[PDB]
Design a protein around this ligand. Structure first.
Ligand SMILES: O=P(O)(O)OC[C@@H](O)[C@H]1O[C@](O)(COP(=O)(O)O)[C@@H](O)[C@@H]1O
Ligand SMILES: O=P(O)(O)OC[C@@H](O)[C@H]1O[C@](O)(COP(=O)(O)O)[C@@H](O)[C@@H]1O
Ligand SMILES: [Mg+2]
Ligand SMILES: [Mg+2]
Ligand code: NA
Ligand code: NA
Ligand code: NA
Lengths: 260, 260
Protein backbone atom coordinates (compact mmCIF):
# COMPACT_ATOMS: atom_id res chain seq x y z
CA UNK A 1 0.00 0.00 0.00
CA UNK A 2 1.16 3.55 -0.76
CA UNK A 3 2.38 5.07 2.51
CA UNK A 4 0.21 7.82 4.00
CA UNK A 5 0.48 10.61 6.51
CA UNK A 6 -2.77 10.89 8.47
CA UNK A 7 -3.16 14.37 10.02
CA UNK A 8 -5.40 14.86 13.07
CA UNK A 9 -6.30 18.15 14.73
CA UNK A 10 -6.71 18.13 18.50
CA UNK A 11 -10.36 17.91 19.61
CA UNK A 12 -12.35 20.83 20.98
CA UNK A 13 -11.06 23.16 23.69
CA UNK A 14 -12.46 26.21 25.54
CA UNK A 15 -10.48 28.43 23.15
CA UNK A 16 -10.99 26.47 19.95
CA UNK A 17 -14.77 26.54 20.32
CA UNK A 18 -14.80 30.29 21.05
CA UNK A 19 -12.23 31.09 18.25
CA UNK A 20 -9.38 32.16 20.57
CA UNK A 21 -5.82 31.54 19.36
CA UNK A 22 -4.23 28.61 21.24
CA UNK A 23 -0.55 28.10 20.74
CA UNK A 24 1.64 27.40 23.72
CA UNK A 25 -1.21 27.67 26.23
CA UNK A 26 -1.53 24.09 27.38
CA UNK A 27 -5.37 23.84 27.38
CA UNK A 28 -7.13 20.49 27.92
CA UNK A 29 -9.96 19.12 25.80
CA UNK A 30 -13.39 20.23 26.91
CA UNK A 31 -15.64 17.26 28.05
CA UNK A 32 -17.33 17.55 24.64
CA UNK A 33 -13.87 17.30 22.95
CA UNK A 34 -13.10 14.03 24.76
CA UNK A 35 -16.42 12.53 23.69
CA UNK A 36 -15.85 13.85 20.18
CA UNK A 37 -12.36 12.28 19.90
CA UNK A 38 -13.65 8.97 21.32
CA UNK A 39 -16.41 8.75 18.65
CA UNK A 40 -13.89 9.78 15.99
CA UNK A 41 -11.64 6.81 16.85
CA UNK A 42 -14.61 4.45 16.87
CA UNK A 43 -15.62 5.77 13.45
CA UNK A 44 -12.16 5.33 11.84
CA UNK A 45 -11.25 1.96 13.44
CA UNK A 46 -14.61 0.35 14.20
CA UNK A 47 -17.83 1.33 12.43
CA UNK A 48 -15.87 2.17 9.28
CA UNK A 49 -12.40 0.96 8.60
CA UNK A 50 -10.73 4.11 7.32
CA UNK A 51 -7.64 3.13 9.33
CA UNK A 52 -6.12 -0.31 9.78
CA UNK A 53 -4.06 -0.55 13.02
CA UNK A 54 -1.71 -3.17 11.49
CA UNK A 55 -0.59 -0.53 8.96
CA UNK A 56 0.23 2.21 11.52
CA UNK A 57 3.93 2.26 12.21
CA UNK A 58 4.49 5.69 13.78
CA UNK A 59 2.36 8.31 15.54
CA UNK A 60 3.86 11.81 15.83
CA UNK A 61 2.33 14.31 18.24
CA UNK A 62 2.69 17.93 19.31
CA UNK A 63 3.81 17.99 22.93
CA UNK A 64 0.59 19.92 23.88
CA UNK A 65 -1.79 18.13 26.25
CA UNK A 66 -4.81 18.58 23.89
CA UNK A 67 -2.81 16.82 21.12
CA UNK A 68 -1.63 13.97 23.41
CA UNK A 69 -5.12 13.63 24.92
CA UNK A 70 -6.36 13.37 21.34
CA UNK A 71 -3.92 10.53 20.54
CA UNK A 72 -5.13 8.77 23.69
CA UNK A 73 -8.83 8.89 22.79
CA UNK A 74 -8.60 8.24 19.01
CA UNK A 75 -6.51 5.10 19.74
CA UNK A 76 -8.86 3.69 22.46
CA UNK A 77 -10.41 1.05 20.07
CA UNK A 78 -7.02 -0.71 19.59
CA UNK A 79 -5.91 -3.80 21.51
CA UNK A 80 -2.71 -3.79 23.58
CA UNK A 81 -1.18 -6.01 20.91
CA UNK A 82 -1.87 -3.51 18.08
CA UNK A 83 -0.54 -0.73 20.37
CA UNK A 84 2.71 -2.64 21.07
CA UNK A 85 3.55 -2.57 17.36
CA UNK A 86 2.97 1.25 17.14
CA UNK A 87 5.65 3.82 18.08
CA UNK A 88 4.60 7.19 19.61
CA UNK A 89 6.94 10.16 19.30
CA UNK A 90 6.51 13.52 20.97
CA UNK A 91 7.87 16.17 18.48
CA UNK A 92 8.28 19.88 19.40
CA UNK A 93 8.46 20.78 15.65
CA UNK A 94 4.72 19.93 15.62
CA UNK A 95 3.57 22.55 18.14
CA UNK A 96 1.16 25.28 17.02
CA UNK A 97 2.25 28.59 15.46
CA UNK A 98 3.73 30.60 18.33
CA UNK A 99 1.22 33.44 18.47
CA UNK A 100 3.28 35.64 20.81
CA UNK A 101 1.30 38.79 21.49
CA UNK A 102 -1.87 37.22 20.04
CA UNK A 103 -2.17 34.32 22.45
CA UNK A 104 -5.83 33.77 23.51
CA UNK A 105 -7.12 36.47 21.17
CA UNK A 106 -9.75 36.47 18.39
CA UNK A 107 -8.98 37.43 14.78
CA UNK A 108 -11.10 40.64 15.02
CA UNK A 109 -9.23 41.58 18.22
CA UNK A 110 -5.82 40.88 16.63
CA UNK A 111 -6.74 43.13 13.64
CA UNK A 112 -7.76 45.85 16.13
CA UNK A 113 -4.52 45.53 18.12
CA UNK A 114 -2.36 45.76 14.97
CA UNK A 115 -4.37 48.74 13.67
CA UNK A 116 -3.68 50.59 16.94
CA UNK A 117 0.06 49.81 16.60
CA UNK A 118 -0.07 51.52 13.19
CA UNK A 119 0.23 48.34 11.12
CA UNK A 120 -1.66 46.91 8.13
CA UNK A 121 -1.89 50.37 6.46
CA UNK A 122 -1.58 49.15 2.84
CA UNK A 123 -3.07 45.64 3.19
CA UNK A 124 -4.82 43.47 5.85
CA UNK A 125 -2.79 41.28 8.25
CA UNK A 126 -2.22 37.79 6.86
CA UNK A 127 -0.66 35.36 9.36
CA UNK A 128 0.64 33.11 6.54
CA UNK A 129 2.78 35.95 5.21
CA UNK A 130 3.22 38.13 8.33
CA UNK A 131 3.36 35.86 11.39
CA UNK A 132 2.78 37.20 14.89
CA UNK A 133 4.53 40.07 16.77
CA UNK A 134 6.72 38.41 19.49
CA UNK A 135 5.69 35.06 17.98
CA UNK A 136 6.82 33.04 14.97
CA UNK A 137 7.29 34.32 11.44
CA UNK A 138 5.99 32.22 8.55
CA UNK A 139 9.50 30.91 7.77
CA UNK A 140 10.15 29.76 11.34
CA UNK A 141 7.03 27.56 11.28
CA UNK A 142 7.63 26.53 7.62
CA UNK A 143 11.15 25.43 8.65
CA UNK A 144 10.23 23.24 11.62
CA UNK A 145 7.30 21.64 9.74
CA UNK A 146 9.65 20.95 6.79
CA UNK A 147 11.99 19.10 9.17
CA UNK A 148 9.11 16.85 10.52
CA UNK A 149 7.93 16.25 6.90
CA UNK A 150 11.39 15.14 5.82
CA UNK A 151 11.58 12.74 8.79
CA UNK A 152 8.12 11.34 8.02
CA UNK A 153 8.78 10.90 4.24
CA UNK A 154 12.22 9.29 4.96
CA UNK A 155 10.52 6.75 7.24
CA UNK A 156 7.88 6.19 4.47
CA UNK A 157 10.61 5.53 1.87
CA UNK A 158 12.51 3.22 4.24
CA UNK A 159 9.27 1.23 4.92
CA UNK A 160 8.21 1.04 1.31
CA UNK A 161 11.71 -0.34 0.52
CA UNK A 162 11.31 -2.92 3.33
CA UNK A 163 8.11 -3.82 1.49
CA UNK A 164 5.70 -2.69 4.21
CA UNK A 165 2.56 -0.59 4.49
CA UNK A 166 3.13 2.61 6.45
CA UNK A 167 0.41 4.91 7.80
CA UNK A 168 2.06 7.57 9.95
CA UNK A 169 -0.13 9.80 12.08
CA UNK A 170 0.39 13.38 13.02
CA UNK A 171 -1.56 14.93 15.87
CA UNK A 172 -1.18 18.65 16.09
CA UNK A 173 -3.12 21.89 15.65
CA UNK A 174 -5.34 23.93 13.33
CA UNK A 175 -2.73 26.30 11.82
CA UNK A 176 0.28 23.95 11.91
CA UNK A 177 -1.55 21.11 10.10
CA UNK A 178 -3.05 23.33 7.41
CA UNK A 179 0.48 24.65 6.92
CA UNK A 180 1.88 21.07 7.03
CA UNK A 181 -0.62 19.84 4.40
CA UNK A 182 0.07 22.84 2.09
CA UNK A 183 3.86 22.39 1.90
CA UNK A 184 3.60 18.57 1.72
CA UNK A 185 2.15 18.73 -1.80
CA UNK A 186 4.23 21.70 -2.86
CA UNK A 187 2.58 25.02 -2.02
CA UNK A 188 4.59 28.09 -1.02
CA UNK A 189 8.22 28.80 -1.80
CA UNK A 190 11.50 26.91 -1.60
CA UNK A 191 14.25 28.52 0.45
CA UNK A 192 17.79 27.18 0.89
CA UNK A 193 19.00 26.59 4.46
CA UNK A 194 21.65 29.30 4.80
CA UNK A 195 21.32 31.18 8.11
CA UNK A 196 22.18 29.75 11.57
CA UNK A 197 18.51 29.14 12.47
CA UNK A 198 17.87 27.40 9.12
CA UNK A 199 20.84 25.08 9.53
CA UNK A 200 20.96 24.06 13.21
CA UNK A 201 19.72 20.80 14.72
CA UNK A 202 17.37 21.94 17.51
CA UNK A 203 16.67 18.48 19.04
CA UNK A 204 12.88 18.74 18.97
CA UNK A 205 12.22 15.01 19.50
CA UNK A 206 14.03 12.16 21.18
CA UNK A 207 13.45 8.79 19.56
CA UNK A 208 16.47 6.96 18.14
CA UNK A 209 14.32 4.98 15.64
CA UNK A 210 13.55 8.21 13.73
CA UNK A 211 16.57 9.27 11.63
CA UNK A 212 17.11 13.06 11.76
CA UNK A 213 17.13 14.58 8.27
CA UNK A 214 19.41 17.64 7.71
CA UNK A 215 17.61 19.88 5.23
CA UNK A 216 19.48 21.66 2.43
CA UNK A 217 16.26 23.51 1.66
CA UNK A 218 12.87 23.98 3.29
CA UNK A 219 9.40 25.26 2.21
CA UNK A 220 7.28 28.06 3.70
CA UNK A 221 4.02 29.77 2.73
CA UNK A 222 3.66 33.42 1.73
CA UNK A 223 -0.22 33.45 1.65
CA UNK A 224 -3.36 31.63 2.86
CA UNK A 225 -3.50 28.07 1.51
CA UNK A 226 -7.33 28.28 1.94
CA UNK A 227 -7.84 25.04 3.77
CA UNK A 228 -10.53 24.00 6.22
CA UNK A 229 -9.81 21.65 9.13
CA UNK A 230 -12.03 21.58 12.18
CA UNK A 231 -11.20 20.53 15.72
CA UNK A 232 -10.75 16.73 15.57
CA UNK A 233 -10.60 16.81 11.76
CA UNK A 234 -8.64 14.20 9.81
CA UNK A 235 -6.65 14.83 6.61
CA UNK A 236 -4.67 12.42 4.47
CA UNK A 237 -1.43 13.17 2.66
CA UNK A 238 0.13 10.55 0.43
CA UNK A 239 1.99 10.10 -2.86
CA UNK A 240 1.15 9.79 -6.57
CA UNK A 241 2.19 6.60 -8.48
CA UNK A 242 3.72 4.78 -5.42
CA UNK A 243 6.49 7.36 -5.50
CA UNK A 244 7.81 9.17 -2.40
CA UNK A 245 9.16 11.92 -4.74
CA UNK A 246 5.56 12.73 -5.83
CA UNK A 247 3.92 13.89 -2.55
CA UNK A 248 0.19 14.50 -2.96
CA UNK A 249 -2.93 15.57 -1.09
CA UNK A 250 -5.71 12.98 -0.81
CA UNK A 251 -8.97 14.82 -1.68
CA UNK A 252 -11.14 12.17 0.03
CA UNK A 253 -9.47 12.78 3.40
CA UNK A 254 -9.72 9.45 5.28
CA UNK A 255 -12.81 8.34 3.27
CA UNK A 256 -12.58 5.13 1.24
CA UNK A 257 -15.43 3.18 -0.33
CA UNK A 258 -16.40 0.11 1.70
CA UNK A 259 -14.84 -3.08 0.29
CA UNK A 260 -16.93 -5.69 -1.61
CA UNK B 1 -24.67 25.52 7.61
CA UNK B 2 -21.84 26.74 5.37
CA UNK B 3 -22.68 25.68 1.80
CA UNK B 4 -20.51 22.94 0.31
CA UNK B 5 -19.65 21.52 -3.07
CA UNK B 6 -19.37 17.72 -2.84
CA UNK B 7 -17.24 16.30 -5.67
CA UNK B 8 -17.64 12.68 -6.77
CA UNK B 9 -15.54 10.81 -9.32
CA UNK B 10 -17.33 8.23 -11.44
CA UNK B 11 -16.86 4.66 -10.22
CA UNK B 12 -14.53 2.13 -11.80
CA UNK B 13 -14.52 1.43 -15.54
CA UNK B 14 -12.56 -0.94 -17.82
CA UNK B 15 -10.20 1.95 -18.67
CA UNK B 16 -10.01 3.57 -15.22
CA UNK B 17 -8.88 0.31 -13.62
CA UNK B 18 -6.26 -0.32 -16.32
CA UNK B 19 -5.05 3.36 -16.32
CA UNK B 20 -6.28 4.20 -19.86
CA UNK B 21 -7.36 7.79 -20.48
CA UNK B 22 -11.16 8.10 -20.69
CA UNK B 23 -12.53 11.37 -21.94
CA UNK B 24 -15.32 11.37 -24.45
CA UNK B 25 -15.43 7.58 -24.75
CA UNK B 26 -18.76 6.80 -23.15
CA UNK B 27 -17.72 3.73 -21.08
CA UNK B 28 -20.05 2.15 -18.52
CA UNK B 29 -19.15 1.22 -14.96
CA UNK B 30 -17.69 -2.24 -14.61
CA UNK B 31 -19.90 -4.57 -12.42
CA UNK B 32 -17.40 -3.89 -9.63
CA UNK B 33 -17.87 -0.09 -10.17
CA UNK B 34 -21.64 -0.41 -9.71
CA UNK B 35 -21.26 -2.35 -6.47
CA UNK B 36 -18.58 0.12 -5.37
CA UNK B 37 -20.86 3.17 -5.96
CA UNK B 38 -23.78 1.46 -4.21
CA UNK B 39 -21.70 0.82 -1.06
CA UNK B 40 -20.37 4.40 -1.26
CA UNK B 41 -23.91 5.82 -1.16
CA UNK B 42 -24.84 3.53 1.74
CA UNK B 43 -21.70 4.70 3.59
CA UNK B 44 -22.39 8.45 3.11
CA UNK B 45 -26.18 8.38 3.66
CA UNK B 46 -26.75 5.33 5.86
CA UNK B 47 -24.01 3.76 7.99
CA UNK B 48 -22.39 7.17 8.42
CA UNK B 49 -24.18 10.41 7.85
CA UNK B 50 -21.57 12.36 5.95
CA UNK B 51 -24.37 13.67 3.73
CA UNK B 52 -27.86 14.79 4.76
CA UNK B 53 -30.35 14.51 1.84
CA UNK B 54 -32.47 17.42 3.21
CA UNK B 55 -29.44 19.69 2.64
CA UNK B 56 -28.80 18.70 -1.02
CA UNK B 57 -30.32 21.27 -3.33
CA UNK B 58 -28.57 20.60 -6.65
CA UNK B 59 -26.69 17.72 -8.28
CA UNK B 60 -24.51 18.59 -11.29
CA UNK B 61 -23.23 15.80 -13.53
CA UNK B 62 -20.98 15.26 -16.55
CA UNK B 63 -23.14 14.01 -19.40
CA UNK B 64 -21.02 10.79 -19.53
CA UNK B 65 -22.84 7.54 -18.76
CA UNK B 66 -20.31 6.53 -16.06
CA UNK B 67 -20.97 9.86 -14.24
CA UNK B 68 -24.80 9.57 -14.54
CA UNK B 69 -24.69 5.89 -13.54
CA UNK B 70 -22.68 7.06 -10.55
CA UNK B 71 -25.36 9.60 -9.55
CA UNK B 72 -27.95 6.84 -9.88
CA UNK B 73 -26.16 4.42 -7.53
CA UNK B 74 -24.86 6.91 -4.89
CA UNK B 75 -28.43 8.29 -4.50
CA UNK B 76 -30.11 4.82 -4.18
CA UNK B 77 -30.54 5.13 -0.34
CA UNK B 78 -32.80 8.22 -0.68
CA UNK B 79 -36.61 8.12 -0.59
CA UNK B 80 -38.71 9.45 -3.49
CA UNK B 81 -39.65 12.36 -1.25
CA UNK B 82 -36.00 13.36 -0.63
CA UNK B 83 -35.33 12.94 -4.39
CA UNK B 84 -38.30 15.20 -5.33
CA UNK B 85 -36.67 18.10 -3.46
CA UNK B 86 -33.31 17.62 -5.32
CA UNK B 87 -32.62 19.09 -8.81
CA UNK B 88 -30.34 17.15 -11.22
CA UNK B 89 -28.61 19.04 -13.99
CA UNK B 90 -26.62 17.58 -16.85
CA UNK B 91 -23.70 20.03 -17.58
CA UNK B 92 -21.34 19.60 -20.56
CA UNK B 93 -18.78 21.95 -18.89
CA UNK B 94 -18.21 19.03 -16.47
CA UNK B 95 -17.01 16.47 -19.02
CA UNK B 96 -13.49 15.08 -18.77
CA UNK B 97 -10.40 16.71 -20.34
CA UNK B 98 -10.73 16.10 -24.08
CA UNK B 99 -7.67 13.89 -24.61
CA UNK B 100 -7.85 14.04 -28.43
CA UNK B 101 -5.01 11.88 -29.73
CA UNK B 102 -4.46 10.27 -26.31
CA UNK B 103 -7.91 8.76 -25.91
CA UNK B 104 -7.67 5.22 -24.43
CA UNK B 105 -3.90 5.46 -23.94
CA UNK B 106 -1.62 5.01 -20.90
CA UNK B 107 0.70 7.72 -19.58
CA UNK B 108 3.87 5.89 -20.72
CA UNK B 109 2.39 5.32 -24.17
CA UNK B 110 1.48 9.01 -24.41
CA UNK B 111 5.07 9.97 -23.45
CA UNK B 112 6.35 7.52 -26.10
CA UNK B 113 4.02 8.94 -28.79
CA UNK B 114 5.05 12.53 -28.05
CA UNK B 115 8.76 11.57 -28.02
CA UNK B 116 8.36 10.09 -31.52
CA UNK B 117 6.67 13.32 -32.74
CA UNK B 118 9.77 15.20 -31.56
CA UNK B 119 8.19 16.81 -28.49
CA UNK B 120 9.19 17.15 -24.83
CA UNK B 121 12.87 17.79 -25.75
CA UNK B 122 13.61 20.26 -22.92
CA UNK B 123 11.13 19.01 -20.28
CA UNK B 124 8.65 16.14 -19.77
CA UNK B 125 5.03 16.45 -20.98
CA UNK B 126 2.75 17.86 -18.27
CA UNK B 127 -0.96 17.75 -19.14
CA UNK B 128 -1.78 20.57 -16.67
CA UNK B 129 0.47 22.93 -18.65
CA UNK B 130 0.49 21.33 -22.13
CA UNK B 131 -2.94 19.75 -22.74
CA UNK B 132 -3.41 17.12 -25.44
CA UNK B 133 -2.68 17.23 -29.21
CA UNK B 134 -6.09 17.44 -30.99
CA UNK B 135 -7.64 17.69 -27.51
CA UNK B 136 -8.12 20.51 -25.01
CA UNK B 137 -5.47 22.91 -23.79
CA UNK B 138 -5.29 23.68 -20.07
CA UNK B 139 -7.07 27.03 -20.57
CA UNK B 140 -10.02 25.47 -22.43
CA UNK B 141 -10.70 23.12 -19.49
CA UNK B 142 -9.86 25.82 -16.90
CA UNK B 143 -12.42 28.06 -18.65
CA UNK B 144 -15.38 25.67 -18.71
CA UNK B 145 -14.71 24.53 -15.11
CA UNK B 146 -14.57 28.20 -14.03
CA UNK B 147 -18.03 28.72 -15.56
CA UNK B 148 -19.55 25.71 -13.64
CA UNK B 149 -17.81 26.97 -10.41
CA UNK B 150 -19.27 30.46 -10.79
CA UNK B 151 -22.72 28.95 -11.35
CA UNK B 152 -22.35 26.71 -8.29
CA UNK B 153 -21.04 29.48 -5.97
CA UNK B 154 -23.79 31.90 -7.19
CA UNK B 155 -26.40 29.30 -6.24
CA UNK B 156 -24.60 28.86 -2.85
CA UNK B 157 -24.73 32.65 -2.22
CA UNK B 158 -28.39 32.83 -3.25
CA UNK B 159 -29.25 29.93 -0.85
CA UNK B 160 -27.21 31.26 2.04
CA UNK B 161 -29.08 34.60 1.62
CA UNK B 162 -32.42 32.72 1.62
CA UNK B 163 -31.18 31.30 4.92
CA UNK B 164 -30.84 27.69 3.74
CA UNK B 165 -28.27 24.91 3.86
CA UNK B 166 -26.88 24.05 0.46
CA UNK B 167 -24.84 20.94 -0.41
CA UNK B 168 -24.33 20.86 -4.18
CA UNK B 169 -22.90 17.73 -5.74
CA UNK B 170 -20.68 17.43 -8.73
CA UNK B 171 -20.24 14.10 -10.49
CA UNK B 172 -17.52 14.10 -13.04
CA UNK B 173 -14.08 12.63 -13.74
CA UNK B 174 -10.56 12.15 -12.39
CA UNK B 175 -8.76 15.02 -14.17
CA UNK B 176 -11.67 17.49 -14.35
CA UNK B 177 -12.43 17.20 -10.61
CA UNK B 178 -8.82 17.54 -9.49
CA UNK B 179 -8.65 20.60 -11.75
CA UNK B 180 -12.02 21.84 -10.38
CA UNK B 181 -10.85 21.43 -6.74
CA UNK B 182 -7.56 23.24 -7.47
CA UNK B 183 -9.04 26.43 -8.96
CA UNK B 184 -11.91 26.51 -6.43
CA UNK B 185 -9.54 27.43 -3.59
CA UNK B 186 -7.30 29.60 -5.72
CA UNK B 187 -4.55 27.59 -7.43
CA UNK B 188 -3.29 28.45 -10.94
CA UNK B 189 -3.49 31.83 -12.67
CA UNK B 190 -6.18 34.41 -13.32
CA UNK B 191 -6.83 35.34 -16.95
CA UNK B 192 -9.33 37.94 -18.16
CA UNK B 193 -11.97 36.78 -20.64
CA UNK B 194 -10.88 38.59 -23.81
CA UNK B 195 -10.95 36.26 -26.82
CA UNK B 196 -14.11 34.96 -28.57
CA UNK B 197 -13.84 31.51 -26.91
CA UNK B 198 -13.32 33.08 -23.47
CA UNK B 199 -16.35 35.33 -23.83
CA UNK B 200 -19.04 33.26 -25.57
CA UNK B 201 -22.00 31.53 -23.91
CA UNK B 202 -21.73 27.93 -25.17
CA UNK B 203 -25.03 26.63 -23.68
CA UNK B 204 -23.56 23.61 -21.91
CA UNK B 205 -26.59 22.93 -19.69
CA UNK B 206 -30.29 23.54 -19.93
CA UNK B 207 -31.97 24.19 -16.61
CA UNK B 208 -33.72 27.53 -16.13
CA UNK B 209 -33.31 27.39 -12.32
CA UNK B 210 -29.52 27.78 -12.66
CA UNK B 211 -28.60 31.38 -13.50
CA UNK B 212 -25.83 31.58 -16.14
CA UNK B 213 -22.84 33.59 -14.89
CA UNK B 214 -20.88 35.61 -17.52
CA UNK B 215 -17.26 35.56 -16.42
CA UNK B 216 -15.04 38.64 -16.68
CA UNK B 217 -12.12 36.43 -15.67
CA UNK B 218 -11.44 32.72 -15.27
CA UNK B 219 -8.72 30.54 -13.63
CA UNK B 220 -6.57 27.80 -15.19
CA UNK B 221 -3.63 25.71 -13.97
CA UNK B 222 -0.09 25.81 -15.38
CA UNK B 223 1.25 22.79 -13.39
CA UNK B 224 0.23 19.63 -11.49
CA UNK B 225 -1.90 20.47 -8.45
CA UNK B 226 -0.69 17.15 -6.92
CA UNK B 227 -4.03 15.80 -5.85
CA UNK B 228 -5.21 12.23 -5.44
CA UNK B 229 -8.79 11.19 -6.18
CA UNK B 230 -9.63 7.60 -6.93
CA UNK B 231 -12.55 6.20 -8.91
CA UNK B 232 -15.65 6.82 -6.79
CA UNK B 233 -13.70 9.21 -4.52
CA UNK B 234 -15.41 12.08 -2.73
CA UNK B 235 -13.99 15.56 -2.09
CA UNK B 236 -15.50 18.54 -0.30
CA UNK B 237 -15.02 22.19 -1.24
CA UNK B 238 -16.55 24.88 0.91
CA UNK B 239 -15.83 28.35 2.33
CA UNK B 240 -13.94 29.90 5.24
CA UNK B 241 -15.87 32.03 7.81
CA UNK B 242 -19.36 31.50 6.26
CA UNK B 243 -18.19 33.64 3.35
CA UNK B 244 -18.74 32.78 -0.34
CA UNK B 245 -15.81 35.12 -1.19
CA UNK B 246 -13.44 32.85 0.81
CA UNK B 247 -13.63 29.53 -1.11
CA UNK B 248 -11.67 26.75 0.62
CA UNK B 249 -10.74 23.08 0.41
CA UNK B 250 -12.05 20.81 3.17
CA UNK B 251 -9.06 18.65 4.21
CA UNK B 252 -11.29 16.00 5.85
CA UNK B 253 -13.08 15.31 2.56
CA UNK B 254 -16.59 14.13 3.49
CA UNK B 255 -15.47 12.92 6.98
CA UNK B 256 -17.09 14.47 10.05
CA UNK B 257 -16.89 13.21 13.63
CA UNK B 258 -20.04 11.37 14.70
CA UNK B 259 -22.40 13.60 16.71
CA UNK B 260 -22.83 13.19 20.50
O1 LIG C 1 -7.47 30.55 9.85
P1 LIG C 1 -8.70 30.90 10.73
O2 LIG C 1 -9.91 29.97 10.35
O3 LIG C 1 -8.99 32.42 10.48
O4 LIG C 1 -8.40 30.68 12.25
C1 LIG C 1 -8.40 29.40 12.81
C2 LIG C 1 -7.25 29.34 13.74
O5 LIG C 1 -7.25 30.55 14.41
C3 LIG C 1 -7.35 28.24 14.77
O6 LIG C 1 -6.15 27.43 14.86
C4 LIG C 1 -5.85 27.24 16.25
O7 LIG C 1 -4.50 27.15 16.52
C5 LIG C 1 -6.42 25.94 16.76
O8 LIG C 1 -5.53 25.37 17.68
P2 LIG C 1 -5.75 23.96 18.32
O9 LIG C 1 -5.91 22.93 17.20
O10 LIG C 1 -7.01 23.88 19.21
O11 LIG C 1 -4.48 23.71 19.18
C6 LIG C 1 -6.39 28.54 16.90
O12 LIG C 1 -5.39 29.61 17.11
C7 LIG C 1 -7.61 28.97 16.05
O13 LIG C 1 -8.83 28.81 16.63
O1 LIG D 1 -2.79 12.20 -13.17
P1 LIG D 1 -2.55 10.67 -13.29
O2 LIG D 1 -2.69 9.98 -11.89
O3 LIG D 1 -1.11 10.53 -13.90
O4 LIG D 1 -3.60 10.01 -14.25
C1 LIG D 1 -4.91 9.77 -13.83
C2 LIG D 1 -5.81 10.13 -14.96
O5 LIG D 1 -5.18 9.68 -16.11
C3 LIG D 1 -7.17 9.47 -14.88
O6 LIG D 1 -8.26 10.42 -15.03
C4 LIG D 1 -9.21 9.85 -15.96
O7 LIG D 1 -9.86 10.77 -16.76
C5 LIG D 1 -10.31 9.10 -15.28
O8 LIG D 1 -11.53 9.38 -15.91
P2 LIG D 1 -12.90 8.85 -15.35
O9 LIG D 1 -13.12 9.42 -13.94
O10 LIG D 1 -12.93 7.31 -15.23
O11 LIG D 1 -13.96 9.37 -16.35
C6 LIG D 1 -8.31 8.98 -16.88
O12 LIG D 1 -7.91 9.62 -18.15
C7 LIG D 1 -7.14 8.49 -16.01
O13 LIG D 1 -7.15 7.16 -15.69
MG1 LIG E 1 -7.29 24.60 22.01
MG1 LIG F 1 -13.65 5.38 -17.22
NA1 NA G 1 -10.48 23.57 27.38
NA1 NA H 1 -8.58 22.29 18.95
NA1 NA I 1 -26.05 30.17 -10.65
Amino acid sequence: LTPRCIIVRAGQTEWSKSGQYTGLTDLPLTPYGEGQMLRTGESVFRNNQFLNPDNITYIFTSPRLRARQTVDLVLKPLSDEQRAKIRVVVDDDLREWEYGDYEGMLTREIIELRKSRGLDKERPWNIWRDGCENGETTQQIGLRLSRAIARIQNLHRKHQSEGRASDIMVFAHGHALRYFAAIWFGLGVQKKCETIEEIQNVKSYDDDTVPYVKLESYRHLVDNPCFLLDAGGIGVLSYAHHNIDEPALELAGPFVSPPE
